[PDB]
Coordinates of C-alpha atoms and ligand atoms in Angstrom, one line a residue:
Chain A
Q1 CA -22.2 -67.8 255.5
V2 CA -20.7 -64.4 256.5
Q3 CA -18.2 -62.4 254.5
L4 CA -15.8 -59.9 256.1
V5 CA -13.8 -58.5 253.1
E6 CA -12.0 -55.4 254.1
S7 CA -10.4 -52.8 251.8
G8 CA -8.3 -49.6 252.3
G9 CA -4.8 -50.9 252.2
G10 CA -2.2 -48.4 250.9
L11 CA 0.9 -46.5 251.7
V12 CA 0.3 -43.0 253.1
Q13 CA 2.8 -40.6 254.7
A14 CA 2.5 -39.8 258.4
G15 CA -0.2 -37.3 259.3
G16 CA -2.6 -38.4 256.6
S17 CA -6.0 -39.9 256.9
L18 CA -7.1 -43.3 255.6
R19 CA -10.6 -44.7 255.6
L20 CA -10.9 -48.5 256.2
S21 CA -14.1 -50.4 255.8
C22 CA -15.1 -54.1 256.1
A23 CA -17.8 -55.6 253.8
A24 CA -20.0 -57.6 256.2
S25 CA -23.1 -59.7 255.5
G26 CA -25.6 -61.8 257.3
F27 CA -26.0 -59.3 260.2
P28 CA -26.6 -55.6 260.9
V29 CA -24.0 -53.0 261.9
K30 CA -26.0 -52.3 265.1
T31 CA -27.0 -55.8 266.0
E32 CA -23.7 -57.3 267.1
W33 CA -20.3 -56.4 268.5
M34 CA -17.9 -55.0 266.0
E35 CA -14.2 -54.5 266.5
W36 CA -11.1 -53.9 264.4
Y37 CA -7.7 -55.2 265.5
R38 CA -4.2 -54.5 264.2
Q39 CA -1.3 -57.0 263.9
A40 CA 2.0 -55.3 263.4
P41 CA 5.0 -57.2 261.8
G42 CA 6.6 -59.0 264.8
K43 CA 4.1 -57.7 267.3
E44 CA 0.9 -59.2 268.8
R45 CA -2.7 -58.7 267.5
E46 CA -3.9 -56.1 269.9
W47 CA -7.4 -54.6 270.1
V48 CA -7.7 -51.0 268.7
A49 CA -11.4 -50.0 268.8
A50 CA -14.9 -51.5 268.8
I51 CA -18.5 -50.6 268.1
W52 CA -21.2 -52.4 270.1
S53 CA -24.7 -53.3 269.0
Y54 CA -27.4 -50.6 268.6
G55 CA -24.8 -47.9 269.3
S56 CA -24.3 -48.8 272.9
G57 CA -20.9 -47.1 273.0
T58 CA -17.5 -46.6 271.5
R59 CA -14.2 -47.7 273.0
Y60 CA -10.6 -47.2 271.9
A61 CA -7.1 -48.2 272.9
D62 CA -4.8 -46.5 275.4
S63 CA -2.2 -45.8 272.7
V64 CA -5.0 -45.0 270.3
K65 CA -7.3 -42.8 272.5
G66 CA -7.8 -39.5 270.7
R67 CA -5.8 -40.7 267.7
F68 CA -8.3 -42.6 265.5
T69 CA -12.0 -42.6 264.9
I70 CA -14.2 -45.7 264.6
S71 CA -17.5 -45.4 262.7
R72 CA -20.2 -47.7 261.4
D73 CA -22.7 -47.7 258.6
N74 CA -25.9 -49.8 258.8
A75 CA -26.9 -48.9 255.2
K76 CA -24.2 -50.9 253.6
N77 CA -23.6 -53.2 256.6
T78 CA -20.0 -51.8 256.9
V79 CA -18.0 -50.0 259.5
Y80 CA -15.8 -47.1 258.2
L81 CA -12.6 -46.7 260.2
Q82 CA -10.5 -43.5 259.7
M83 CA -7.5 -42.2 261.6
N84 CA -5.7 -38.8 261.8
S85 CA -2.1 -38.0 262.4
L86 CA -0.8 -41.6 261.9
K87 CA 2.1 -42.5 264.1
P88 CA 5.2 -44.1 262.6
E89 CA 4.5 -47.3 264.6
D90 CA 0.9 -47.4 263.4
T91 CA 1.8 -49.3 260.3
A92 CA 0.2 -52.7 260.7
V93 CA -2.1 -55.3 259.1
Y94 CA -5.6 -54.4 260.2
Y95 CA -8.5 -56.9 260.5
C96 CA -12.1 -57.0 261.6
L97 CA -13.9 -59.5 263.8
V98 CA -17.6 -60.4 264.0
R99 CA -18.1 -59.9 267.8
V100 CA -16.1 -59.8 271.0
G101 CA -15.1 -63.3 270.2
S102 CA -16.7 -64.7 267.1
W103 CA -16.2 -67.5 264.5
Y104 CA -15.8 -65.0 261.7
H105 CA -12.5 -63.1 261.2
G106 CA -11.6 -60.7 258.4
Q107 CA -9.2 -61.5 255.6
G108 CA -6.9 -58.7 256.7
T109 CA -5.8 -55.4 255.3
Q110 CA -2.3 -54.1 255.5
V111 CA -1.5 -50.4 255.7
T112 CA 1.9 -48.6 255.6
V113 CA 2.8 -45.4 257.6
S114 CA 6.3 -44.9 256.2
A115 CA 7.5 -41.4 257.2
Chain B
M1 CA -52.0 -74.7 338.6
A2 CA -49.7 -75.6 335.7
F3 CA -46.0 -76.0 335.0
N4 CA -45.4 -72.3 335.2
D5 CA -46.3 -72.4 338.8
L6 CA -43.8 -75.1 339.7
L7 CA -41.2 -73.3 337.6
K8 CA -41.7 -70.0 339.4
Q9 CA -41.5 -72.1 342.6
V10 CA -38.0 -73.0 341.3
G11 CA -37.6 -69.6 339.8
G12 CA -36.9 -68.4 336.3
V13 CA -34.0 -66.0 336.9
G14 CA -31.6 -68.4 338.6
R15 CA -28.1 -69.4 337.7
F16 CA -29.3 -72.4 335.7
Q17 CA -31.9 -70.4 333.8
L18 CA -29.1 -68.2 332.5
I19 CA -26.2 -70.6 331.9
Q20 CA -28.3 -73.1 330.1
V21 CA -29.9 -70.5 327.8
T22 CA -26.6 -68.7 327.0
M23 CA -24.7 -72.0 326.3
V24 CA -27.5 -73.3 324.1
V25 CA -27.7 -70.1 322.1
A26 CA -23.9 -69.8 321.8
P27 CA -23.6 -71.8 318.6
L28 CA -26.2 -69.5 316.8
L29 CA -23.3 -67.2 316.0
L30 CA -21.7 -69.9 313.9
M31 CA -25.1 -70.8 312.6
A32 CA -25.4 -67.4 311.0
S33 CA -21.8 -67.8 309.9
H34 CA -22.5 -71.1 308.1
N35 CA -25.7 -69.7 306.6
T36 CA -23.8 -66.8 305.0
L37 CA -20.6 -68.8 304.4
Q38 CA -21.0 -69.5 300.7
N39 CA -20.7 -65.7 300.1
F40 CA -17.1 -65.6 301.4
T41 CA -16.3 -69.1 300.1
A42 CA -17.7 -68.9 296.5
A43 CA -16.4 -65.5 295.5
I44 CA -15.4 -65.4 291.8
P45 CA -12.1 -63.6 291.3
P46 CA -11.3 -62.2 287.8
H47 CA -10.3 -65.0 285.5
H48 CA -9.4 -65.7 281.9
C49 CA -8.4 -68.5 279.6
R50 CA -5.1 -70.1 280.3
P51 CA -2.9 -69.7 277.2
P52 CA -1.8 -73.0 275.7
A53 CA 1.6 -74.2 277.0
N54 CA 2.9 -75.1 273.5
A55 CA 3.2 -71.4 272.5
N56 CA 5.8 -69.1 274.1
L57 CA 4.4 -66.5 276.5
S58 CA 7.3 -64.0 276.2
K59 CA 8.5 -63.6 272.7
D60 CA 5.1 -64.3 271.1
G61 CA 3.5 -61.1 272.4
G62 CA 2.6 -61.7 276.0
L63 CA -0.8 -62.1 277.7
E64 CA -2.8 -60.1 275.1
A65 CA -2.7 -62.0 271.8
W66 CA -4.9 -64.9 273.1
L67 CA -7.5 -63.2 275.4
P68 CA -10.0 -60.7 273.8
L69 CA -11.0 -57.9 276.1
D70 CA -14.5 -57.3 277.5
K71 CA -16.7 -54.2 277.4
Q72 CA -14.7 -52.7 280.3
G73 CA -11.2 -53.6 278.9
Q74 CA -10.8 -56.7 281.0
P75 CA -9.9 -60.2 279.7
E76 CA -12.7 -62.4 278.5
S77 CA -14.2 -64.9 280.9
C78 CA -14.2 -68.3 279.2
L79 CA -13.0 -67.7 275.6
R80 CA -9.7 -67.5 273.8
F81 CA -8.2 -67.2 270.4
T82 CA -6.9 -70.4 268.7
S83 CA -3.9 -68.6 267.3
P84 CA -2.1 -65.4 268.4
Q85 CA -2.0 -63.9 264.9
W86 CA -4.3 -65.1 262.1
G87 CA -2.3 -64.5 259.0
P88 CA -2.6 -66.6 255.7
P89 CA 1.2 -66.6 255.4
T90 CA -11.4 -73.4 260.7
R91 CA -12.4 -71.7 264.0
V92 CA -10.6 -68.8 265.6
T93 CA -12.3 -68.7 269.1
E94 CA -12.0 -71.5 271.6
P95 CA -13.1 -72.3 275.2
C96 CA -10.5 -72.6 277.9
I97 CA -9.9 -76.4 277.5
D98 CA -6.4 -75.7 278.8
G99 CA -7.8 -74.6 282.2
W100 CA -8.2 -71.1 283.6
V101 CA -5.8 -68.6 285.2
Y102 CA -7.1 -66.7 288.3
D103 CA -5.6 -64.0 290.4
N104 CA -4.5 -64.1 294.1
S105 CA -4.7 -60.4 294.6
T106 CA -7.5 -60.5 297.2
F107 CA -8.9 -64.1 297.4
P108 CA -6.1 -66.7 297.4
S109 CA -8.2 -69.8 296.7
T110 CA -12.0 -70.3 296.8
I111 CA -14.3 -73.1 295.5
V112 CA -14.6 -71.5 292.0
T113 CA -10.8 -71.4 291.8
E114 CA -10.4 -75.0 293.1
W115 CA -12.9 -76.5 290.7
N116 CA -13.2 -74.0 287.8
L117 CA -16.9 -73.2 288.0
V118 CA -17.0 -70.5 285.4
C119 CA -19.0 -69.9 282.2
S120 CA -20.2 -73.3 281.0
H121 CA -21.4 -75.2 284.1
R122 CA -21.0 -72.1 286.2
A123 CA -24.4 -72.7 287.8
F124 CA -22.9 -75.3 290.1
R125 CA -21.9 -72.4 292.5
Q126 CA -25.5 -71.6 293.1
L127 CA -26.4 -75.3 293.0
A128 CA -24.3 -75.8 296.1
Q129 CA -26.1 -73.2 298.0
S130 CA -29.5 -74.4 296.8
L131 CA -28.8 -77.9 297.8
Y132 CA -27.5 -76.8 301.2
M133 CA -30.8 -74.9 301.7
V134 CA -32.7 -78.0 300.6
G135 CA -30.9 -79.8 303.4
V136 CA -31.9 -77.0 305.7
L137 CA -35.6 -77.6 304.9
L138 CA -35.4 -81.4 305.0
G139 CA -33.7 -81.2 308.4
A140 CA -36.2 -78.7 309.8
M141 CA -39.0 -81.1 308.8
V142 CA -37.7 -84.6 309.5
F143 CA -35.4 -83.9 312.3
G144 CA -38.1 -81.7 314.0
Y145 CA -40.5 -84.6 313.8
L146 CA -37.9 -87.1 315.0
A147 CA -37.2 -84.7 318.0
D148 CA -40.9 -84.6 318.8
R149 CA -40.9 -88.4 318.7
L150 CA -37.8 -88.9 320.8
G151 CA -36.7 -85.7 322.7
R152 CA -34.5 -82.6 322.6
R153 CA -31.2 -83.3 324.4
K154 CA -30.3 -86.3 322.2
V155 CA -31.4 -84.6 319.1
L156 CA -29.3 -81.5 319.9
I157 CA -26.3 -83.8 320.5
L158 CA -26.9 -85.5 317.1
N159 CA -27.2 -82.0 315.5
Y160 CA -23.9 -80.9 317.0
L161 CA -22.0 -84.0 315.9
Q162 CA -23.5 -83.9 312.4
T163 CA -22.8 -80.2 311.9
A164 CA -19.2 -80.6 313.1
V165 CA -18.3 -83.6 311.0
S166 CA -20.1 -82.3 308.0
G167 CA -18.3 -79.0 308.2
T168 CA -14.9 -80.6 308.6
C169 CA -15.4 -83.1 305.8
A170 CA -16.8 -80.4 303.5
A171 CA -13.7 -78.4 304.2
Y172 CA -11.6 -81.5 303.2
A173 CA -13.8 -82.5 300.3
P174 CA -12.1 -83.9 297.2
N175 CA -14.9 -83.7 294.5
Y176 CA -17.6 -81.2 293.9
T177 CA -20.5 -83.6 294.4
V178 CA -19.0 -84.8 297.7
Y179 CA -18.9 -81.1 298.9
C180 CA -22.5 -80.6 297.8
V181 CA -23.7 -83.7 299.7
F182 CA -21.7 -82.6 302.7
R183 CA -23.5 -79.2 302.5
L184 CA -26.8 -81.1 302.3
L185 CA -26.0 -82.9 305.6
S186 CA -24.7 -79.6 307.2
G187 CA -27.9 -77.9 306.4
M188 CA -29.9 -80.9 307.6
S189 CA -28.3 -80.5 311.0
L190 CA -28.1 -76.7 311.1
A191 CA -31.8 -76.0 310.6
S192 CA -32.7 -78.6 313.2
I193 CA -30.4 -77.1 315.8
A194 CA -31.6 -73.6 314.9
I195 CA -35.3 -74.4 315.4
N196 CA -34.7 -76.7 318.5
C197 CA -32.7 -73.9 320.2
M198 CA -35.8 -71.7 320.2
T199 CA -38.2 -74.5 321.1
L200 CA -36.1 -75.7 324.0
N201 CA -35.5 -72.3 325.4
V202 CA -39.2 -71.3 325.1
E203 CA -40.1 -74.6 326.8
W204 CA -37.7 -74.1 329.7
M205 CA -38.6 -70.4 330.3
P206 CA -41.6 -68.9 332.0
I207 CA -44.5 -67.2 330.3
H208 CA -43.1 -63.7 330.6
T209 CA -39.8 -64.5 328.8
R210 CA -40.8 -65.1 325.2
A211 CA -39.9 -61.5 324.2
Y212 CA -36.6 -62.0 326.1
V213 CA -35.9 -65.1 324.0
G214 CA -36.7 -63.3 320.8
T215 CA -34.5 -60.3 321.5
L216 CA -31.7 -62.6 322.6
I217 CA -31.8 -64.7 319.5
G218 CA -31.8 -61.6 317.3
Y219 CA -28.9 -60.1 319.1
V220 CA -26.9 -63.3 318.9
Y221 CA -27.8 -63.7 315.2
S222 CA -26.5 -60.2 314.4
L223 CA -23.3 -60.6 316.6
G224 CA -22.6 -63.9 314.9
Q225 CA -22.8 -62.4 311.4
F226 CA -20.4 -59.8 312.7
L227 CA -18.2 -62.7 313.8
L228 CA -18.2 -64.0 310.3
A229 CA -17.2 -60.6 309.1
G230 CA -14.2 -60.7 311.5
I231 CA -13.2 -64.3 310.7
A232 CA -13.3 -63.6 307.0
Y233 CA -11.1 -60.5 307.6
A234 CA -8.8 -62.9 309.5
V235 CA -8.2 -65.9 307.3
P236 CA -8.8 -65.8 303.6
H237 CA -8.3 -69.4 302.7
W238 CA -11.5 -71.3 302.2
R239 CA -10.3 -74.6 303.8
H240 CA -8.8 -72.9 306.8
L241 CA -11.9 -70.6 307.3
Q242 CA -14.2 -73.5 306.8
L243 CA -12.4 -75.4 309.6
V244 CA -12.4 -72.4 311.8
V245 CA -16.2 -72.0 311.5
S246 CA -16.7 -75.8 311.8
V247 CA -14.7 -76.6 314.9
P248 CA -16.6 -74.5 317.4
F249 CA -19.6 -76.8 317.1
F250 CA -17.2 -79.7 317.8
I251 CA -15.8 -78.1 321.0
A252 CA -19.2 -76.9 322.1
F253 CA -20.5 -80.4 321.9
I254 CA -18.3 -81.4 324.8
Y255 CA -20.1 -78.9 327.2
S256 CA -23.3 -79.6 325.4
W257 CA -23.2 -83.1 326.9
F258 CA -24.4 -81.4 330.1
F259 CA -27.8 -80.0 328.9
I260 CA -30.9 -80.5 330.9
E261 CA -33.8 -82.1 329.1
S262 CA -37.2 -80.3 328.8
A263 CA -39.3 -81.1 331.8
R264 CA -42.4 -80.2 329.9
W265 CA -41.5 -82.6 327.1
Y266 CA -41.1 -85.3 329.8
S267 CA -44.5 -84.5 331.2
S268 CA -46.1 -84.5 327.8
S269 CA -44.3 -87.8 327.1
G270 CA -46.5 -89.4 329.8
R271 CA -43.7 -90.4 332.2
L272 CA -43.2 -88.4 335.4
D273 CA -40.3 -90.2 337.2
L274 CA -37.6 -88.7 335.0
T275 CA -39.6 -85.4 335.2
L276 CA -39.3 -85.4 339.0
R277 CA -35.6 -86.3 338.6
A278 CA -35.1 -83.4 336.3
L279 CA -36.8 -81.0 338.7
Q280 CA -34.7 -82.3 341.6
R281 CA -31.5 -81.9 339.5
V282 CA -32.4 -78.3 338.5
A283 CA -33.3 -77.5 342.1
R284 CA -29.9 -78.8 343.1
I285 CA -28.2 -76.7 340.4
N286 CA -30.4 -73.6 341.3
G287 CA -29.1 -74.1 344.9
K288 CA -32.6 -74.5 346.5
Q289 CA -33.8 -77.7 347.9
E290 CA -36.2 -77.1 350.8
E291 CA -39.0 -75.9 348.5
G292 CA -38.2 -78.5 345.9
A293 CA -38.3 -81.3 348.5
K294 CA -42.1 -81.1 348.6
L295 CA -42.2 -81.9 344.8
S296 CA -43.5 -85.5 344.7
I297 CA -45.0 -87.7 341.9
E298 CA -48.5 -86.8 342.9
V299 CA -47.6 -83.1 343.3
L300 CA -47.1 -82.5 339.6
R301 CA -49.7 -85.2 338.7
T302 CA -52.3 -82.9 340.3
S303 CA -50.7 -79.9 338.7
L304 CA -50.3 -80.9 335.0
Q305 CA -53.5 -82.4 333.7
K306 CA -55.5 -79.6 332.0
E307 CA -53.2 -79.2 329.0
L308 CA -52.7 -83.0 328.7
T309 CA -56.5 -83.5 328.1
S310 CA -53.3 -80.6 311.6
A311 CA -53.0 -79.7 307.9
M312 CA -56.2 -81.2 306.5
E313 CA -58.4 -79.0 308.7
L314 CA -56.0 -76.1 308.1
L315 CA -56.8 -76.3 304.3
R316 CA -60.4 -77.3 304.8
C317 CA -61.8 -74.1 306.3
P318 CA -62.2 -71.5 303.6
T319 CA -61.3 -68.4 305.7
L320 CA -58.5 -70.3 307.5
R321 CA -57.2 -71.6 304.2
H322 CA -57.1 -68.1 302.8
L323 CA -55.3 -66.5 305.7
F324 CA -52.9 -69.4 305.9
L325 CA -52.1 -69.0 302.2
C326 CA -51.6 -65.3 302.6
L327 CA -49.4 -65.7 305.7
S328 CA -47.3 -68.5 304.1
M329 CA -46.9 -66.5 300.9
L330 CA -45.7 -63.6 302.9
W331 CA -43.1 -65.8 304.7
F332 CA -42.0 -67.3 301.4
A333 CA -41.5 -63.9 299.7
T334 CA -39.8 -62.3 302.7
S335 CA -37.2 -65.1 303.2
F336 CA -36.6 -65.5 299.5
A337 CA -36.0 -61.8 299.0
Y338 CA -33.8 -61.6 302.1
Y339 CA -31.5 -64.4 301.0
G340 CA -31.4 -63.2 297.4
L341 CA -30.3 -59.8 298.7
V342 CA -27.7 -61.1 301.2
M343 CA -26.3 -63.8 299.1
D344 CA -24.9 -61.4 296.4
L345 CA -22.2 -58.9 297.1
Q346 CA -20.0 -59.3 294.0
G347 CA -21.3 -56.3 292.2
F348 CA -20.9 -53.9 295.2
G349 CA -17.4 -52.6 294.4
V350 CA -16.5 -52.2 298.1
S351 CA -14.5 -54.7 300.1
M352 CA -16.4 -57.8 301.3
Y353 CA -15.4 -57.3 304.9
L354 CA -16.6 -53.7 305.1
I355 CA -20.0 -54.4 303.5
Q356 CA -20.4 -57.4 305.8
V357 CA -19.7 -55.4 309.0
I358 CA -21.9 -52.5 308.0
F359 CA -24.7 -55.1 307.3
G360 CA -24.0 -56.3 310.9
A361 CA -24.2 -52.7 312.2
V362 CA -27.5 -51.9 310.5
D363 CA -29.5 -54.7 312.1
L364 CA -29.8 -53.4 315.7
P365 CA -31.2 -50.0 314.7
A366 CA -33.6 -51.8 312.4
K367 CA -34.7 -53.9 315.4
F368 CA -35.2 -50.8 317.5
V369 CA -37.2 -49.1 314.8
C370 CA -39.4 -52.1 314.2
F371 CA -40.1 -52.4 318.0
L372 CA -40.9 -48.7 318.2
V373 CA -43.3 -48.7 315.3
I374 CA -45.1 -51.9 316.4
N375 CA -45.5 -50.5 319.9
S376 CA -46.5 -47.0 318.8
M377 CA -48.3 -47.1 315.4
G378 CA -49.0 -50.8 314.7
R379 CA -47.6 -54.0 313.2
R380 CA -49.5 -54.3 309.9
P381 CA -48.8 -50.8 308.5
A382 CA -45.2 -51.2 309.5
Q383 CA -45.2 -54.5 307.7
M384 CA -46.3 -53.1 304.3
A385 CA -44.0 -50.2 304.8
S386 CA -41.0 -52.3 305.4
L387 CA -41.8 -54.4 302.2
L388 CA -42.3 -51.2 300.2
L389 CA -39.0 -49.7 301.2
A390 CA -37.2 -53.0 300.7
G391 CA -38.7 -53.5 297.3
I392 CA -37.9 -50.0 296.1
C393 CA -34.4 -50.4 297.5
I394 CA -33.9 -53.5 295.5
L395 CA -35.3 -52.2 292.2
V396 CA -33.3 -48.9 292.3
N397 CA -30.2 -50.8 293.2
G398 CA -30.8 -53.0 290.2
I399 CA -31.4 -50.2 287.7
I400 CA -28.6 -47.9 288.9
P401 CA -25.4 -48.6 287.0
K402 CA -22.6 -50.5 288.7
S403 CA -20.3 -47.5 288.5
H404 CA -22.1 -45.9 291.5
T405 CA -20.8 -47.5 294.7
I406 CA -21.5 -45.6 297.9
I407 CA -25.2 -45.0 297.1
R408 CA -25.6 -48.7 296.0
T409 CA -24.0 -50.0 299.2
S410 CA -25.9 -47.7 301.5
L411 CA -29.2 -48.5 299.8
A412 CA -28.6 -52.2 300.0
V413 CA -27.7 -51.7 303.7
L414 CA -31.1 -49.9 304.2
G415 CA -32.9 -52.7 302.3
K416 CA -31.4 -55.4 304.4
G417 CA -32.2 -53.5 307.6
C418 CA -35.8 -52.9 306.8
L419 CA -36.1 -56.5 305.6
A420 CA -34.8 -57.8 309.0
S421 CA -37.3 -55.5 310.6
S422 CA -40.0 -57.0 308.4
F423 CA -38.8 -60.5 309.5
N424 CA -39.3 -59.6 313.2
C425 CA -42.7 -58.1 312.3
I426 CA -43.9 -61.1 310.4
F427 CA -42.8 -63.5 313.1
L428 CA -44.6 -61.5 315.8
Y429 CA -47.7 -61.1 313.7
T430 CA -47.9 -64.8 312.9
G431 CA -47.4 -65.7 316.6
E432 CA -50.1 -63.2 317.7
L433 CA -52.5 -63.9 314.9
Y434 CA -53.2 -67.7 314.7
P435 CA -55.6 -69.4 317.1
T436 CA -53.8 -71.2 319.9
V437 CA -55.0 -74.7 318.6
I438 CA -52.8 -74.4 315.4
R439 CA -50.4 -71.7 316.4
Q440 CA -47.4 -74.0 316.6
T441 CA -48.3 -75.8 313.4
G442 CA -48.9 -72.5 311.8
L443 CA -45.5 -71.2 312.7
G444 CA -44.1 -74.5 311.4
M445 CA -45.9 -74.1 308.0
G446 CA -44.7 -70.4 307.8
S447 CA -41.1 -71.5 308.5
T448 CA -41.3 -74.3 305.9
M449 CA -42.6 -72.0 303.1
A450 CA -39.9 -69.5 304.1
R451 CA -37.4 -72.2 303.7
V452 CA -38.9 -73.0 300.3
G453 CA -38.4 -69.4 299.2
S454 CA -34.9 -69.4 300.5
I455 CA -34.3 -72.6 298.5
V456 CA -35.6 -71.1 295.3
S457 CA -33.6 -67.9 295.8
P458 CA -30.2 -69.4 294.5
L459 CA -32.1 -71.0 291.6
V460 CA -33.5 -67.6 290.6
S461 CA -30.1 -66.0 291.0
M462 CA -28.5 -68.6 288.9
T463 CA -30.1 -67.0 285.8
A464 CA -27.6 -64.1 285.7
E465 CA -26.5 -64.9 282.2
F466 CA -29.9 -64.0 280.6
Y467 CA -29.5 -60.4 281.8
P468 CA -26.9 -59.2 284.4
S469 CA -29.5 -57.8 286.9
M470 CA -32.9 -59.5 286.3
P471 CA -32.2 -61.7 289.3
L472 CA -32.3 -58.4 291.2
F473 CA -35.4 -57.5 289.3
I474 CA -37.2 -60.6 290.5
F475 CA -35.8 -60.1 294.0
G476 CA -37.4 -56.7 294.1
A477 CA -40.6 -57.7 292.3
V478 CA -41.5 -60.5 294.7
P479 CA -42.0 -58.5 298.0
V480 CA -43.9 -55.6 296.3
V481 CA -46.5 -58.3 295.5
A482 CA -46.1 -59.6 299.0
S483 CA -46.9 -56.2 300.4
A484 CA -49.8 -55.9 298.0
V485 CA -51.3 -59.1 299.3
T486 CA -50.5 -58.3 302.9
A487 CA -52.4 -55.1 302.5
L488 CA -55.6 -57.2 302.9
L489 CA -55.9 -59.2 306.1
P490 CA -57.5 -58.8 309.5
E491 CA -55.8 -56.4 311.9
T492 CA -54.8 -57.4 315.4
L493 CA -54.6 -54.1 317.3
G494 CA -57.6 -55.2 319.4
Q495 CA -55.4 -57.9 321.1
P496 CA -58.1 -60.6 320.6
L497 CA -55.6 -63.5 320.6
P498 CA -58.1 -66.1 319.2
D499 CA -58.3 -69.6 320.7
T500 CA -61.0 -71.3 318.6
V501 CA -61.6 -71.4 314.9
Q502 CA -65.0 -69.9 315.4
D503 CA -63.4 -66.6 316.6
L504 CA -61.7 -65.3 313.4
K505 CA -64.9 -64.3 311.7
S506 CA -66.0 -62.6 315.0
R507 CA -63.1 -60.2 314.8
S508 CA -63.6 -59.5 311.1
Ligands
RTO601 C1 -37.2 -63.7 315.5 C2 -36.5 -65.1 315.5 C3 -36.7 -65.9 314.3 N1 -35.8 -67.1 314.3 C4 -36.4 -68.4 314.0 C5 -36.0 -69.3 315.2 C6 -36.1 -70.8 314.8 S1 -34.1 -66.9 314.0 O1 -33.3 -67.5 315.0 O2 -33.7 -65.5 314.1 C7 -33.7 -67.5 312.3 C8 -33.2 -68.7 312.1 C9 -32.9 -69.2 310.9 C10 -33.1 -68.4 309.8 C11 -32.8 -69.0 308.4 O3 -32.0 -69.9 308.2 O4 -33.3 -68.4 307.4 C12 -33.7 -67.2 309.9 C13 -34.0 -66.7 311.2

C-alpha cells in the first residue's frame, strides 16, 4: 500500500519556524500531485499549499501567500513544509494528501501557535 | 439549341428568377445556425460536486470542506471528499453521486446542465454532434438519391417539414437518446435541403449565373452565422433559442408551398406536358406571354435531345483513381479541420457572442482575398497557402498557453477566415478540374468525404481528457498533410476544362 506518516507536531511561539514532513512511499515526490491541508479546531479543512508532479509549479493560499514555504524532497520521497512568522490563527492539525483528490490521506499532525 | 435558349427567351433576370432564388436560399441562414447550434447549446459552465444534503452547509464550514481545488484554484470537476474533516476522533474521495451544482452567471441552462454530462460519460456532448453530422451525411446521400428519383419540390417540402418538427421536438426532448435521435433526423433533413438548394438554383438559372449562385450562397451563409450570433445574444435559454431557430423553417414552409419545379428535371424525367405547363406558368409569372405562346410540345422536343442522348469506373482508372483520392482526401481534411476549429470556443476566454460575430466579420474579406488571388496568381498556390496558414494558426493556438487571449482569438479568426477561403478554392478547383462526364458525381463524392471528415471531427475532439489540447494538435496536423498532398496534382491555369477521360493525361 501507501504510507503517509507525517511528523513535526509541537508547540512553538509565534514568529518561529517549524519544518513539517510526510513520509510517503510507493510513488515519487515529482510524479504525482502533493498538497498539505490544515484543519483548525472548529474550522473547515482548507487547502494551504501544493506541489505538482515534476516541479510543474507551486501554489499557496490567499491567507498563506508569502507566509509559508512548501518544499519537496525526492531522495527520501518526502515533502518538507516550513513556515515563518506563524500567525496566532495558524494553529491547526496539518495533513497531507496523495494527489488533488486521492484515496490516500495522511494520519494528521497537530501544531500549536500559542502566543 | 438547348434549354438555355428557351430560358433566355423567357429571360433569366426577371421577377420570378429573383423571388424564387431569394426565397429558396432564405432558410440557409438558419441552416448555418443549426449547424453551429451545438456550440451555443452545449456550453459547459463551471461545475462541482453537490455537497451531500445530510451535512449542514453553514455551520460545518461552508462550500470549501467538500470540494478540492484545481490547479487554478477552482473547485474540482467531478470529485468530492466523503467527509469534511478526516479526524480519528475506507475511501476519502468520492464522485458526485448526489448530483452536481452549476452556475447561472452567464448560461442559465444548457444541455450539459440539464443532463449532467460531465467527467464520466462526458463524451455524450460530442456524441450528440457526431450523430447529428452522421444524420447530415445519411440525408445528403439517401435523400439526394430519392430526390433524383422523384423530384425537387416535394423533396424540399419534406425537408422543410422534417427540419421544423425535428427541431421543435428536439427542443422539447425528455431524454438524452431522444434528443440525439431528433438531431439525427434534423441533420438528415438539413443536409438534403442544403444540397438541393444549390442544385435547384443552378438548374433554374442560365449558364452565366453559377458564380452569382456561389457568391450568393456564401453571403447568405455568413449572414446567417451572424444571425446566430445575434440570436444567442438575444435569448440564452437552450429550449427557447432552439425553438427560435426551429420555427422559421416551419413558417417558411407555408410560402415554400409555392415553389416552381425544375423544368430541366421534368425534361430529363421524359415527360414534357408538365414541362410545358411549367414554362407557361413561369411566363405568366414573368409577365410575358406573346413569346411564350409559341412554346409547343414539339418546340422543346426539337430543342432538348442532344443532352438526353459511376464509381466503379471512377476507381478503375489508375490516374483517375489517384486524382479522385487526392481530391477527396483534401475535402475530408478541409471540412474536418474547419468543423474542429469552429466547434470549440470554450478555451477562448472572450465572450461567445463577440467571438462569434468577429468570426462572421472575417469571412467576407477572406472571400475577397481568395477571389483576388485565384483571379490574379492562381488557384492551386493559393490553396496550399491557405492550408499552410490555417495549419500554423491551429498549432500555434494549441501550444500557446490559455492565459493569452487577444492573440489566440485573433489567430483563430485568421485561421477560420483562411479556411473558408480554402473552402471556396477547393470547391472551385473541383468544379473546374473534373471531366464533364463525372463532374457532378465527383462533386458528390467530395461532399460525402467532407461530411465523413466533419463526422469524425467531434469524435477526435472527444479525446480531450488524454491531453487538454491534442485535439487541437490533430486539427492542425491534418491540413498540413493535406497541403503536402495537394502540392502534387495537375494545374488548371490553361483552362482546359476536360470532357473525356482521355484528356487528363494530355494536359499532364
Ligand atoms: C461554395 C458553396 C459550397 N456550399 C455547398 C452547397 C451544397 S455551402 O452552401 O456554402 C455549404 C453547405 C453545407 C456545409 C456543411 O454542412 O459543412 C458547408 C458548406
